Amino acid sequence: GLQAQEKQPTPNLVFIMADQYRGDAIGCIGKEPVKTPHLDKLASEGINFTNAISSYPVSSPARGMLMTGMYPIGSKVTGNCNSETAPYGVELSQNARCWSDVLKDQGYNMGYIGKWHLDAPYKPYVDTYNNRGKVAWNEWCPPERRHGFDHWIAYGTYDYHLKPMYWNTTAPRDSFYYVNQWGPEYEASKAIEYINGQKDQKQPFALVVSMNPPHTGYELVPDRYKEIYKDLDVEALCKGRPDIPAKGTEMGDYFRNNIRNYYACITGVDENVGRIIEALKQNNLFDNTIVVFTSDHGICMGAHENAGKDIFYEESMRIPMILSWPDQIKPRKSDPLMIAFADLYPTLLSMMGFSKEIPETVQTFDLSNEVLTGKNKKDLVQPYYFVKFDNHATGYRGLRTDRYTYAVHATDGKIDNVILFDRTNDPHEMNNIASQQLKLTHTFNRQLKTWLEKTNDPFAQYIKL
Amino acid sequence: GLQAQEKQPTPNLVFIMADQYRGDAIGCIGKEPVKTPHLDKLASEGINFTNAISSYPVSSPARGMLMTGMYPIGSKVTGNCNSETAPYGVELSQNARCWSDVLKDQGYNMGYIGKWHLDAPYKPYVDTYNNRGKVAWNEWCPPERRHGFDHWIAYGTYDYHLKPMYWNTTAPRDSFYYVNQWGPEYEASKAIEYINGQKDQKQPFALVVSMNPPHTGYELVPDRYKEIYKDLDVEALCKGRPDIPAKGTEMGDYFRNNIRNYYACITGVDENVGRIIEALKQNNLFDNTIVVFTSDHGICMGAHENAGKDIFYEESMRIPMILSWPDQIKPRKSDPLMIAFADLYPTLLSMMGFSKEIPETVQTFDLSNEVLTGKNKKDLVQPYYFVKFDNHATGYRGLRTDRYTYAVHATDGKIDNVILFDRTNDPHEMNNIASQQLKLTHTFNRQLKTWLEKTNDPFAQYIKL
Numbered sequence: 031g032l033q034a035q036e037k038q039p040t041p042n043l044v045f046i047m048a049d050q051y052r053g054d055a056i057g058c059i060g061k062e063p064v065k066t067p068h069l070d071k072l073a074s075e076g077i078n079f080t081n082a083i084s085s086y087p088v089s090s091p092a093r094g095m096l097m098t099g100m101y102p103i104g105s106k107v108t109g110n111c112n113s114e115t116a117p118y119g120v121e122l123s124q125n126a127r128c129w130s131d132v133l134k135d136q137g138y139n140m141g142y143i144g145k146w147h148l149d150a151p152y153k154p155y156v157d158t159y160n161n162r163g164k165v166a167w168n169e170w171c172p173p174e175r176r177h178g179f180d181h182w183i184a185y186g187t188y189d190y191h192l193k194p195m196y197w198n199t200t201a202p203r204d205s206f207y208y209v210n211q212w213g214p215e216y217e218a219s220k221a222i223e224y225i226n227g228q229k230d231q232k233q234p235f236a237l238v239v240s241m242n243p244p245h246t247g248y249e250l251v252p253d254r255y256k257e258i259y260k261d262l263d264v265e266a267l268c269k270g271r272p273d274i275p276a277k278g279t280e281m282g283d284y285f286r287n288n289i290r291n292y293y294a295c296i297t298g299v300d301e302n303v304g305r306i307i308e309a310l311k312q313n314n315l316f317d318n319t320i321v322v323f324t325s326d327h328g329i330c331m332g333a334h335e336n337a338g339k340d341i342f343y344e345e346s347m348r349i350p351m352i353l354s355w356p357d358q359i360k361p362r363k364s365d366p367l368m369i370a371f372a373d374l375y376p377t378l379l380s381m382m383g384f385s386k387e388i389p390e391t392v393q394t395f396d397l398s399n400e401v402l403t404g405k406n407k408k409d410l411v412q413p414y415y416f417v418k419f420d421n422h423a424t425g426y427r428g429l430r431t432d433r434y435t436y437a438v439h440a441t442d443g444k445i446d447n448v449i450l451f452d453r454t455n456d457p458h459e460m461n462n463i464a465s466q467q468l469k470l471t472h473t474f475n476r477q478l479k480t481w482l483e484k485t486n487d488p489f490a491q492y493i494k495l
Numbered sequence: 496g497l498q499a500q501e502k503q504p505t506p507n508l509v510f511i512m513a514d515q516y517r518g519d520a521i522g523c524i525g526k527e528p529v530k531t532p533h534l535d536k537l538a539s540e541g542i543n544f545t546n547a548i549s550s551y552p553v554s555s556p557a558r559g560m561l562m563t564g565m566y567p568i569g570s571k572v573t574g575n576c577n578s579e580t581a582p583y584g585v586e587l588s589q590n591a592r593c594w595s596d597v598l599k600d601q602g603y604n605m606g607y608i609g610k611w612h613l614d615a616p617y618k619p620y621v622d623t624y625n626n627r628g629k630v631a632w633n634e635w636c637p638p639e640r641r642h643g644f645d646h647w648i649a650y651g652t653y654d655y656h657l658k659p660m661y662w663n664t665t666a667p668r669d670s671f672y673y674v675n676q677w678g679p680e681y682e683a684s685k686a687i688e689y690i691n692g693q694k695d696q697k698q699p700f701a702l703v704v705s706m707n708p709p710h711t712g713y714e715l716v717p718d719r720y721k722e723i724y725k726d727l728d729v730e731a732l733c734k735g736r737p738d739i740p741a742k743g744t745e746m747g748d749y750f751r752n753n754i755r756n757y758y759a760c761i762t763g764v765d766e767n768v769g770r771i772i773e774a775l776k777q778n779n780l781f782d783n784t785i786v787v788f789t790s791d792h793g794i795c796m797g798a799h800e801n802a803g804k805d806i807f808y809e810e811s812m813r814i815p816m817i818l819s820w821p822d823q824i825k826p827r828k829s830d831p832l833m834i835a836f837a838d839l840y841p842t843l844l845s846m847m848g849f850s851k852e853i854p855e856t857v858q859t860f861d862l863s864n865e866v867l868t869g870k871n872k873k874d875l876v877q878p879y880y881f882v883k884f885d886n887h888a889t890g891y892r893g894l895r896t897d898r899y900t901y902a903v904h905a906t907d908g909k910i911d912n913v914i915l916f917d918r919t920n921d922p923h924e925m926n927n928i929a930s931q932q933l934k935l936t937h938t939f940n941r942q943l944k945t946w947l948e949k950t951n952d953p954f955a956q957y958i959k960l
């Protein structure tokens with residue numbers, strides 16, 4: 031089998047994501063001194079979407095949108111999967127038609143390695159540290175809930191990166207195993223084995239590699255990656271950042287005390303992404319494979335007095351989004367397309383030649399043409415979400431345009447607050463100008479209402495015209 | 496922020512210690528009529544190590560071993576810190592890699608409240624009563640000598656419990672302040688404020704609360720605690736205690752005249768420990784926090800004709816050692832593990848998920864597995880020390896097995912005395928049987944020599960094989 035054989039009529043897919051990875055934390059973007067040589071290289075061979083976002087910047091909700099192509103109400107994943115939200119059915123539906131189900135039906139070899147976080151835990155909880163106490167977070171994904179991912183080396187959620195746990199394809203619920211290796215390292219090694227096994231190109235394949243770092247347990251990263259930032263000037267990083275509290279404050283110190291390890295995690299993740307790319311090139315599986323590097327959400331880490339994410343601020347919504355496909359896409363410096371994490375379902379499927387297979391239930395944007403050609407879509411506006419899992423009449427709904435971030439809050443069906451930021455004049459979003467721009471607010475109000483009605487979201491009824 | 500958020504991958508730590516607290520002075524142990532309802536409750540929710548000891552039962556030396564994880568010669572704290580030992584460098588090294596430095600590096604919020612006693616005083620001495628006269632004992636701990644403890648409300652040493660003094664985090668050397676409240680009361684109040692501030696769980700935390708009572712100034716305890724023992728039958732306490740001198744003697748009367756107030760102090764300390772535990776439970780910070788209650792050493796108080804400690808007798812070496820961590824440790828009635836005060840550095844760090852961070856310089860036992868599982872270590876033998884600060888060739892070196900206490904004394908490098916007690920047949924250690932057990936003494940001799948050689952202790956050369 032040394033002779034070159036027929037190229038598959040549809041491309042492979044290697045979907046790589048790292049949890050809690052901020053969009054501006056990429057070296058080639060030139061905004062932060064974080065080292066990501068492998069992602070920079072990947073970007074140079076493809077496209078770097080510098081305005082990409084995640085509409086509901088929370089783990090399960092974001093992943094739920096990605097898999098179903100539906101906004102939160104429809105995906106049913108309105109909050110993180112854990113025992114607190116379980117009674118409300120917060121988990122991916124076994125009946126949901128996900129993009130992985132589609133590719134499996136189209137004859138693709140399927141694999142998933144890493145964090146899934148789309149199953150509701152139930153008693154008795156599996157024996158991992160994050161299941162002890164009042165609230166459990168980790169649960170097994172039985173075969174019938176894997177949506178086509180036949181090769182399985184994954185877990186629900188678990189954050190001790192230095193000794194991660196996984197369930198292989200045939201392991202029963204209580205037979206997960208621990209690995210004495212950094213998560214991204216092990217995951218990249220298993221991804222390489224999977225990729226090596228696809229070298230004969232007898233059929234197409236789709237592989238997801240879902241890494242945990244740079245998600246918390248920021249310090250849980252190998253020392254060699256920390257050494258790279260031992261001389262990092264943290265105070266210099268806060269220069270011109272009014273959104274980062276001053277030194278001496280709770281949140282200002284939180285940012286300063288964790289930024290070094292956050293970058294260490296990213297650089298470590300970067301190196302392992304490099305290993306996967308190298309495996310693809312070694313097996314001649316890079317040119318006709320769509321490789322995507324993205325994240326479910328960013329992180330505030332003290333900025334805006336917020337420690338986590340789950341908020342409309344840029345540091346929370348902005349995510350990396352690098353895509354390569356040498357055979358069909360010429361490299362483009364930077365693309366301003368406001369593609370969202372959840373748009374990947376219809377976008378990738380259409381790019382892959384399966385546009386007719388996208389379910390009528392999919393609500394997100396099919397930006398395949400924009401991605402392939404680079405043709406802009408200036409009218410593209412993405413939504414923002416926060417849904418109280420036990421009371422949908424409470425929460426946030428908003429819109430993000432290329433210039434403004436607008437959001438309204440409601441409590442029991444009544445609008446409670448209005449927020450508007452002009453990111454051009456106020457890039458760090460420090461001035462809520464909603465009360466100063468009544469005309470503009472009214473315009474966004476009808477626009478939001480129309481959006482909520484289009485997506486069959488009951489919240490639409492709270493906006494009184 | 497009402498929704499439950501991700502559990503930290505490593506636990507918090509609340510290390511509580513009361514100076515000069517005897518191991519058997521715990522109510523649930525059933526040997527003495529002292530009331531400790533809060534510690535009894537803590538024990539019931541965790542583990543009570545009834546054979547725990549302190550190898551060098553003296554304040555600074557013991558604390559020095561705890562912080563560095565090294566035996567006395569290596570820790571450099573060979574005697575109490577005061578102006579007499581200062582010329583010999585008896586103090587914690589600023590360059591010593593302590594467990595607190597490790598946790599700080601791992602992103603933990605750090606706090607220390609109470610007695611430190613690890614700094615050598617220097618002229619002009621700070622203005623406290625114990626610094627007047629020929630020998631000064633109290634000194635300030637500048638920020639660079641705090642080994643990572645950012646939140647600081649502490650002092651060197653000071654024993655007038657009714658009006659204690661402290662230095663807050665930013666106070667200069669001569670700006671300490673006095674408080675008109677019982678030490679343990681104030682300390683518990685400050686610990687509660689610290690704990691309340693950790694409720695958002697944005698990062699892990701480690702807090703040390705080092706209380707002075709039941710250390711001398713035995714009478715310096717609130718009247719309400721003394722009232723509890725107003726009817727205590729002191730003579731009954733001496734029943735079956737041949738180690739306690741008879742009434743009418745100097746040491747026999749000393750024991751009888753101070754036992755009531757000693758218990759009063761303990762009960763008072765107990766109540767304040769209860770306040771701290773309650774704060775942890777109120778903030779949902781008890782289940783995933785390792786809580787430790789221990790002491791640097793016990794006290795003879797007249798027993799064996801000794802007023803103080805700094806000796807191999809059980810009443811001096813035995814210390815309380817209660818540990819709880821609901822999320823990972825099921826309660827165990829009593830554990831016979833002979834864990835030592837100084838073993839907490841490697842033991843806690845490994846239990847917390849930072850085994851790889853223990854310096855190669857650490858010499859004490861890592862008993863994390865034993866503590867977590869309850870798996871015994873029958874071969875565990877702990878050392879005993881007494882080092883003459885101005886002449887290391889003089890002093891004691893010994894071993895404590897589950898049955899025997901063996902010790903040898905040397906003067907200028909020559910063995911001066913041999914002591915051996917069979918605690919099974921002679922629990923109150925009244926019969927030195929060394930001269931009657933030559934075979935056994937020879938066995939312990941080689942065992943001691945091997946121990947001293949392993950720990951790079953020059954005293955090893957004095958034992959002539």
